[PDB]
């Protein structure tokens, strides 16, 4: 009947050394016949493979520091990190393996808190060498911003473009705790020459109004 997995809080910004505490709830009980609650924690990180931290609700994966502690049974489980470091930064997920099929929560963003930083926006036309290949990749860059939440909107001749776009954000910088992001609009050479002005529109909490960076192709 597919157990619904809920997670709270939605987001968590923390001071290096301060403790964190993530909770996870299941729509039905995950207690198994052998007395074990089959629910495991893992953290997602950009450009990395997911790291398993806790399993069987309370048992710690070998190699994970003692800062991590698993708690709960039945329908309520909590993960606690006593001294959050920069390497602990990521989006934390709980997943139940008791009932088929497996199900996981929405996740909780955990990163180091810093002051709000508005992104520096730069747009780049495709190279003449790549257009010689028949492909055009327009790139919009968002540099050193916090928090992660940001929206990139591509516009072609002031018309909204949504297709043929890829987004890629870095990990939280271990030093200044900012993020950097790149969005690439990849078009055919023929489609690329059907428009005059290319622009990306960026929305971020630190900006009063959306910032648009444009260019015109020759
Ligand atoms: Cl498990
Ligand atoms: K910046």
Using only CA atoms, what is the Rg? 22 Å
Tell me the major beta sheet: 7 strands, mixed
Q: Give a list of the ligands.
A: chloride ion, potassium ion
Give the count of structural domains.
2
Shape: elongated
Per DSSP E runs of 2 or more residues, the count of β-strands stands at: 19
Quote the distance from N terminus to C terminus: 58 Å
Provide tags for this entry.
4% helix, seven-stranded mixed beta sheet, 19 strands, four-stranded antiparallel beta sheet, Immunoglobulin-like, monomer, binds chloride ion, 2 domains, mainly beta, 218 residues, binds potassium ion, 2 helices
Overall description:
The chain has two domains: 5-112, Immunoglobulins (Immunoglobulin-like), CATH 2.60.40; 120-216, Immunoglobulin-like, CATH 2.60.40.10. Strands 2, 4, 5, 6, 9, 10 and 11 form a seven-stranded mixed beta sheet that branches. Strands 1-3-8-7 form a four-stranded antiparallel beta sheet, with no helix packed on it. The chain has helices at 128-132, 189-192; strands at 5-8, 11-14, 20-26, 39-44, 51-55, 59-60, 68-73, 76-81, 90-96, 103-104, 108-112, 120-124, 135-145, 150-156, 159-161, 165-169, 179-188, 197-204, 211-216. The longest helix is centred in the middle third of the chain and has 5 residues, at 128-132. A hairpin with a 6-residue loop joins β4 and β5 (51-55). The protein is mostly beta strands and 218 residues long. It is elongated and about 70 Å long. It binds chloride ion (CL) and potassium ion (K).
